[PDB]
Design a protein around this ligand. Structure first.
Ligand SMILES: C[S@@+](CC[C@H](N)C(=O)[O-])C[C@H]1O[C@@H](n2cnc3c(N)ncnc32)[C@H](O)[C@@H]1O
Ligand SMILES: C[S@@+](CC[C@H](N)C(=O)[O-])C[C@H]1O[C@@H](n2cnc3c(N)ncnc32)[C@H](O)[C@@H]1O
Ligand SMILES: [Zn+2]
Ligand SMILES: [Zn+2]
Lengths: 185, 184
C-alpha cells in the first residue's frame, strides 16, 4: 500500500514528479542506523534531487574505508554540519562554505541524541571544520526560517550559490511533507 | 490565512500550478448559491477550462443569459444527473452525441439541493439527461462522486483526453492539499 521508492501510500506516490538538479556542493549522509528507512526521514529527500549524494552506516569502532577515503579526499573541502553550540573551544567553526574547493557537507543523520553521539565519537571528523548554518535563507524559498536534514541542506545549497538545486529540493521537500500529512488523514 | 482564489491555506496555495487546457466540450455550472465552501469541487472545472459558465439558480426567475445559453442551437445541451431520477418519458443518453459541441449542465449543490434543481427547472426539462460512465476514471488513476470527478469522465467520454487529464491532476493536487490543511 506504500510505494517502496518514495515511502508514501501508493496513491500519493510522487516518484513521477522527481526532477534531479545539479550542484557544485556534495552531501554525505552519516546514518546512525541505516535500518529500513522511515518515511519521516528527510535526509533521503536530498539524494532524490542530488543523486550523487553518498550515505554511510555509522560505526563507533570500524569506520568504512569508503567513508575514510571520501572525507580524506583533498579534492573536497569537507565540513561537519552540526550546531556550533556543540563544538569545543578549540574547534574551528565557520559560517560560510569556504572558497575554491567544492564543499562536502557531512550530515549527522539520526535523532538528536544519536547525532550528538556521532558528533563526539567519530575521530575521523574531529579535525574538520563545523559549518554553522544560516537558516534565515529559507525565506527566499518560502520556507519557515529544530530544522530537519532537508531544510538545512536547502540553506547550505543556497549558501554555496547552488540556487537551482536549493529551489529544486525546496519544492521536492514541500511536495513530500504535503503528501505525508495527507496520507496521515 | 486562506488564499482567496484557491481557498486553501496560504502555505498550500496552488495558484501558480494551474495550467489551463482546451476542449471541445463546455460546462455550465448551475449553483444553488454562490461565499463558496473550499470543499466545493465544481469551481475546479473553471480553473482548467476558463470558458466554463456559472449561474445562480433561481426557482422563480432564471436569468436571461442562462436561458440564452441553453437555447443556443450552436450547442447540444445536456443535463448531467443520475438517470435513475429521470421521467419515463425523459430522453436519457449514455454518450455525448457527435457533431455539435456538448454543453454539460451540472447541478452544483448538495444532493438535496441538486434534486430540487433537477425537478423544479422547466427550462431544462426538454433537454436530454446524460448518464455518466464513471469507470473511465481508471484511465486517470481516480476513484457518490463529486462534481469535478463527473466532469473528468464526461471530458473523456467526449474525446477531450488532454483536458480530462489536466483536470484529474488539478483535482488530485487540490484534494491532497485540502487533506494536508485539515491536518496541522
Ligand atoms: C538531528 S537530525 C534530525 C533528523 C530529522 N528527523 C530528519 O528529517 O531527518 C538533523 C541534522 O541536520 C543537521 N542540522 C539540524 N539543525 C542544524 C543546525 N541548526 N545547524 C547545523 N546543522 C543542523 C545536523 O546534521 C543534524 O544532525
Ligand atoms: C450532488 S453534486 C456534489 C457536490 C459536491 N459537494 C461538490 O462540490 O463536488 C454532484 C453533481 O454532479 C453530477 N453527478 C454526480 N454524480 C453523478 C452521476 N452518478 N451521474 C450523473 N451525474 C452525476 C450531478 O450534476 C450532481 O448534481
Ligand atoms: Zn513513489
Ligand atoms: Zn491560491
Amino acid at each position: 500500500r506504500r510505494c517502496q521508492r518514495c515511502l508514501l501510500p501508493e496513491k500519493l506516490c510522487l516518484c513521477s514528479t522527481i526532477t534531479p538538479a545539479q550542484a557544485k556542493s556534495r552531501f554525505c549522509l552519516l546514518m546512525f542506523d541505516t535500518e529500513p528507512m522511515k518515511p519521516s526521514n528527510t535526509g533521503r529527500l536530498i539524494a532524490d534531487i542530488l543523486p550523487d549524494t553518498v550515505a554511510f552506516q555509522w560505526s563507533r569502532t570500524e569506520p568504512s574505508q569508503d567513508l575514510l577515503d571520501l572525507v580524506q579526499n583533498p579534492y573536497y573541502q569537507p565540513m561537519v554540519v552540526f550546531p556550533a553550540s556543540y563544538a569545543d573551544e578549540q574547534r574551528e567553526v565557520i559560517f560560510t562554505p569556504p572558497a575554491g574547493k567544492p564543499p562536502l557537507f557531512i550530515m549527522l543523520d539520526g535523532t538528536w541524541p544519536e547525532a550528538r553521539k556521532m558528533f563526539r565519537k567519530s575521530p575521523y571528523l574531529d579535525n574538520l571544520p563545523v559549518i554553522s548554518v544560516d537558516l534565515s535563507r529559507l525565506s527566499a524559498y518560502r520556507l519557515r526560517e529544530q530544522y530537519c536534514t532537508a531544510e538545512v541542506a536547502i540553506a547550505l545549497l543556497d549558501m554555496a550559490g547552488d540556487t537551482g538545486a536549493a529551489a529544486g529540493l525546496g519544492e521536492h521537500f514541500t511536495r513530500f511533507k504535503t503528501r505525508y500529512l495527507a496520507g496521515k488523514t
